[PDB]
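During the second year of the project, the team shifted from modelling isolated chains to modelling whole assemblies. The rationale, set out in the original proposal, was that interfaces cannot be judged from single-chain predictions alone. As a representative example for this report, we include one of the complexes processed in the last quarter. Its constituent sequences, exactly as entered into the pipeline, are reproduced here:
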Amino acid sequence: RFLKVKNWETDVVLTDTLHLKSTLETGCTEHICMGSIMLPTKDQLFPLAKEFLDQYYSSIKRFGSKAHMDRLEEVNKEIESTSTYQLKDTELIYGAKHAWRNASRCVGRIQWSKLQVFDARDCTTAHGMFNYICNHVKYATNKGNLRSAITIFPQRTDGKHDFRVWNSQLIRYAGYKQPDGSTLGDPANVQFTEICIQQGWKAPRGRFDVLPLLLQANGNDPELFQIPPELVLEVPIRHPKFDWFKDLGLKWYGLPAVSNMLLEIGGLEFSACPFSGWYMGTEIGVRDYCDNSRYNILEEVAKKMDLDMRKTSSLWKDQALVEINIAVLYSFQSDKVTIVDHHSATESFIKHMENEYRCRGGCPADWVWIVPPMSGSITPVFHQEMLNYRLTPSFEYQPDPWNTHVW
Amino acid sequence: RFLKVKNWETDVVLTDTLHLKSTLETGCTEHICMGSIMLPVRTKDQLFPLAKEFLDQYYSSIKRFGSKAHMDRLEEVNKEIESTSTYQLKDTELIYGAKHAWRNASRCVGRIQWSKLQVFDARDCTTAHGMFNYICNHVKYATNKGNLRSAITIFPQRTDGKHDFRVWNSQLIRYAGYKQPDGSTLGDPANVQFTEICIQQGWKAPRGRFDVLPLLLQANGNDPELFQIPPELVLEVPIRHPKFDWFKDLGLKWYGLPAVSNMLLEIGGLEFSACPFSGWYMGTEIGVRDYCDNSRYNILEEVAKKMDLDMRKTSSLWKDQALVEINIAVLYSFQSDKVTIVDHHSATESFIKHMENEYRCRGGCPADWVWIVPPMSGSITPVFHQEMLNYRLTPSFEYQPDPWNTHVWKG
Ligand code: HEM
Ligand code: HEM
Ligand SMILES: Cc1cc(N)nc(C[C@@H]2CNC[C@@H]2OCCCCCc2cccc(N)n2)c1
Ligand SMILES: Cc1cc(N)nc(C[C@@H]2CNC[C@@H]2OCCCCCc2cccc(N)n2)c1
Ligand SMILES: C[C@H](O)[C@H](O)[C@H]1CNc2nc(N)[nH]c(=O)c2N1
Ligand SMILES: C[C@H](O)[C@H](O)[C@H]1CNc2nc(N)[nH]c(=O)c2N1
Ligand SMILES: [Zn+2]
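Output from the structure prediction step:
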């Protein structure tokens, strides 16, 4: 009931107390650790509301004041009456910033308090959703000078009227099974691409086709919309030394924007809440390009470098991985699109951890997601012990809507 | 109960029943995961249960469960415990035990090899000098002129915890670290504290960047004694690079034999506080950690300087670049000298095959993801994408505190 984390590179020891305020369940027991698993009424709602408003009023230094006891009473009466309640704009902004603050898998949280929140709770149609989302994309992109933002559609009511963005991210590339047997474009999105085509989409059947948004308002069947191309900022990938790199024909998008998550604030569930920041280089160059199940480009790059691909021990995979990531970084920087490298991002996260320990009593962190997918041990997060626990407000993963929705 | 693990690259789903045989604690709760925390005298009362579990397991493994030989051995151990407070393992049980501790070691990526382990029974040992002889024979057997063979040497078990055998070195072979008055370190920073104990015990330090440390050995709870491993027994590899001819002039070398000596082996309730074991290196242990940790030899800058990498900002990935070249060098050098080494691609691939086999035949394989994933190039190895269940099985290896913090000095 008082826990220590040690950094093994610097010997700095931090003391966590924030974990006692933790509420949801981790997946682990005394007997089994699930640290590496990807997915481990009225009466229910008032405690959840209360817990939230208590933290909110404490943050603005008005815990136990009349404005506190009055809001607690107002919310209580509204739940009693309507079976739900509405958040004040101030509460909504706070909840959103804190769900990011609490996101244990996010390395970029030094940035948590600079989050532009777009209140789309007044939305009612898929066309409305499209308008809001285009406005979010343009605001956040900001001609390459990226700004963090979230747009929050209306909360869950009876659960049969959910707003959902069916895309997993606002901007992604299509994937198509080929006669060949192989895959064209991004294999992650084969299924979704089919759902779009089975719902009307005219696919260009290219390697890098920006998918249509597929939007669900008020539990209705979802509809298709193309994001204005002038709003989707893309980056052709070149290398600062390798002439031939450009000829691979690689590009990626500047805006990472997760839109399949569920934002939970004071017991309320916001099932459509796309949010966006900016990239860490490795997300694109290590994962998007190199994962066997993704664009899987290592072989082709290794060939152009003329490495010895005969034996794994020549580290040809590793050598090519580094250059691919140098090129991702160099291209974003040259075209002036915000990107951070894993050295700088993990160094920032250590600074943020220390702020959160002295200021808040801790910082939940999932080491398995926080340490970059390349060069783990030469980044400082490798040597930092972390405690992982679930705080609310939070972002939660939710099932793909096609698996659920009735048509 | 059944727990499933998915591999997100292949969609292969495995079912773990083995976790049901797990007994000890993880450190985690339903409220906190301590998966990245590095560290998350027995009565009769406790002992016979631990013995019984163990012998039930051993007897099952030989398909003799419930045999007269099994029941007679249970009775015998019961009696030995009731009358003497402890018991002695048969050779066959010791061997099986040491094999299964390695098999159960969830942080070890090398476990495909668990059944081929040479066990040296050193339970007749009585003196530090005896321990020294035993360790020499182990080093020479394991080294085998570069054709490394896994081995373990097992000294007498704990009795009252006042009479422990301990190897004070954390590994049998390691380099001296020396703190300089100006605050720099010469040689290996990890070993500064232990080097200082050695010096105080009378070791004459050469004060070089790569001095092999003397063994400091404790028998029967006595004060530790110093011994120099014969140099002809310490196989070393000079580090050079296939294309970069200046690599050799950095003056690096490493020892071929990774040999962990500070861990405690538990078999059937008995505690073997000195049980050095050895295998062979995966290249990244040396090339990533030993050379490139900031708290170790820290050679990234010097390498990148020689390579003329752009070092003015991190986003040139100069560190990532230098790190790969060094790792290339370590594997090249070992291979050229015919010293057994495995790369992290081949090791993780073998591990996944081992792991799947273990689910089919054993009903699980406990694995610590934080340690199994290599410290470079994580996601281009198949373990990154592998969900893993971590739990504790016995027989087992455990961390124990360094003996210089606990030892009662006799004078
Ligand atoms: C501003 C720059 C940001 C950086 C550099 C960054 C970095 C990252 C990275 C590298 C990951 C792991 C992604 C992966 O490997 O798939 C991640 C995950 C995550 N981040 Fe951030 N992030 C940023 C902004 C944001 C914002 C604005 C939010 C929410 C407001 C957020 C919340 C999350 C969540 C919930 C996850 C886990 C996603 C999942 O479970 O699939 N992050 N972050
Ligand atoms: C045969 C070749 C072997 C290879 C390639 C191998 C590989 C490794 C590696 C890379 C680690 C992580 C160590 C680190 O990064 O510091 C490790 C840990 C470990 N291995 Fe192995 N291993 C081998 C043999 C053995 C043997 C023979 C045993 C005992 C019989 C053993 C038991 C352990 C234990 C207990 C750990 C955790 C050590 C700790 O917590 O400090 N391994 N293995
Ligand atoms: C099964 C599953 C669970 C879960 N919690 N998340 C996922 C999505 C997978 C996990 N890793 C890659 C993929 O998600 C991509 C998420 C987008 C990246 C997150 C992000 C958000 C904001 C900024 C930024 N730089 N990066 C999948
Ligand atoms: C605090 C602590 C706990 C714990 N369980 N282990 C340690 C020792 C740390 C862990 N990683 C670096 C350092 O020890 C070196 C590990 C020894 C190598 C393991 C090994 C054995 C046999 C063969 C091989 N290739 N590798 C430290
Ligand atoms: C099985 C394992 O949990 C899975 O591969 C995780 C590992 N760490 C990760 N880390 C990040 N940042 N993103 C991921 O998608 C994953 N995948
Ligand atoms: C804090 C963290 O658990 C610690 O630095 C671990 C991470 N993973 C590791 N993995 C291996 N193989 N060896 C190690 O020493 C470590 N150190
Ligand atoms: Zn856990």
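Chain A touches chain B through 64 residues (CB under 8 Å). The first helix of chain A runs from residue 42 to 59.
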